């Protein structure tokens with residue numbers, strides 16, 4: 001039900017080997033670790049969760065952009081890129097969170113489908 | 115070697131049934147029709163060309179954004195979105211041209227891979 | 229030293245009356261309130277801080293996008309847009325944090341200048 | 345009535361000395377030169393036209409991104425960024441055309457206001 005895709009706007013490529021951490025907001029408003037991984041050669045991270053586990057709630061996707069740029073020897077602005085959203089059962093069932101990265105900027109969108 | 119992908123930033127979805135026209139710059143600097151189609155349910159348009167036909171040169175991808183918004187009953191700013199680039203044999207062989215559409219804005223990127 | 233600018237990609241306009249909260253990471257690693265305000269009719273928020281107060285640190289600028297969209301009758305995807313960055317670590321700079329908002333997407337950039 | 349603003353997403357700065365050419369579609373469907381200039385140190389290009397000259401029509405703003413990147417040692421993807429729009433069809437408006445540039449990507453938006 002959840003896929004994260006990261007692209008590099010400097011090289012025109014997938015952003016490969018980017019660390020991604022997913023958190024779920026707890027009852028006490030803290031962020032509890034949920035799923036994590038590193039993007040593949042396609043810039044994608046699949047297999048984070050299952051339909052059973054991915055219940056309604058507020059989730060945060062944290063993308064380690066700073067390490068990505070530093071590994072390319074490029075000085076970046078942001079510490080990370082964070083995407084925070086509510087999962088809703090009334091909407092479509094599959095969520096792609098995409099991010100398009102530059103050193104001093106990023107774009108992010110959601111593609112939510114059945 | 116060429117795929118076009120169009121996304122809708124208002125609905126969080128693929129942009130389906132969007133007309134896309136591809137042109138190649140001729141020797142006299144005019145744009146000659148090359149390929150065209152309409153995006154699929156996934157927002158993608160595959161099958162535009164073949165490796166044999168997609169020689170080095172300057173290409174233009176024109177995305178009919180205005181008709182897309184008008185069909186949703188939404189007033190848009192742009193007449194269309196145009197992406198103009200050089201195909202280069204020294205670079206990677208596969209080109210994805212992606213566009214993320216809003217009524218008064220768009221983002222576009224290239225994902226160029228082997 | 230710090231300005232925030234927010235634009236609306238649906239209407240082609242400034243995003244007016246957007247709430248913005250700025251935090252600074254404390255020595256104990258918590259986010260401390262630093263400053264807040266709302267965008268003006270130009271989509272800009274000035275006057276958040278001073279060059280004396282805006283010391284080195286890790287700052288978070290939280291833009292309350294959800295409240296903004298809901299008031300237009302759009303049920304948006306994101307809770308907020310957060311921008312996290314180290315500031316002033318090579319001496320004072322001027323920072324503009326800009327965001328371009330859609331219901332299911334946003335772009336953000338920084339314009340960083342050196343006052344001399 | 346028409347301002348163009350260009351930002352650099354790699355450096356976090358205005359995109360300075362970017363060439364911009366504006367065209368207007370003629371009655372014979374050709375693109376007629378309308379006005380041109382280069383972005384200033386703020387990344388802005390003012391003074392392209394007047395409210396009298398900027399009549400109804402279909403306009404193209406061509407931003408010469410390739411030349412800009414090449415001068416930074418980046419071989420970019422696009423030839424240029426072109427923005428095509430109908431202007432002033434409900435009376436005069438003020439238009440800001442903004443672009444945020446990366447070597448393989450750009451974003452563009454419009455801010456359209458009504459002077460009253």
Ligand SMILES: Oc1c(Cl)cc(-c2cc(Cl)c(O)c(Cl)c2)cc1Cl
Pocket residue numbers: 005007096098099100107108109111119121210212213214221222223225
């Ligand atoms: O498959 C995708 C490709 Cl190729 C591109 C984008 C994508 C994502 C963002 Cl944030 C953008 O600004 C643009 Cl222009 C494309 C998204 C997906 Cl899901």
Ligand SMILES: Oc1c(Cl)cc(-c2cc(Cl)c(O)c(Cl)c2)cc1Cl
Pocket residue numbers: 233235324326327328335336337339349351440442443444451452453455
């Ligand atoms: O003054 C500005 C104007 Cl008009 C536009 C942007 C701006 C900001 C983002 Cl995030 C964009 O994707 C685009 Cl295309 C423009 C920024 C500033 Cl500071």
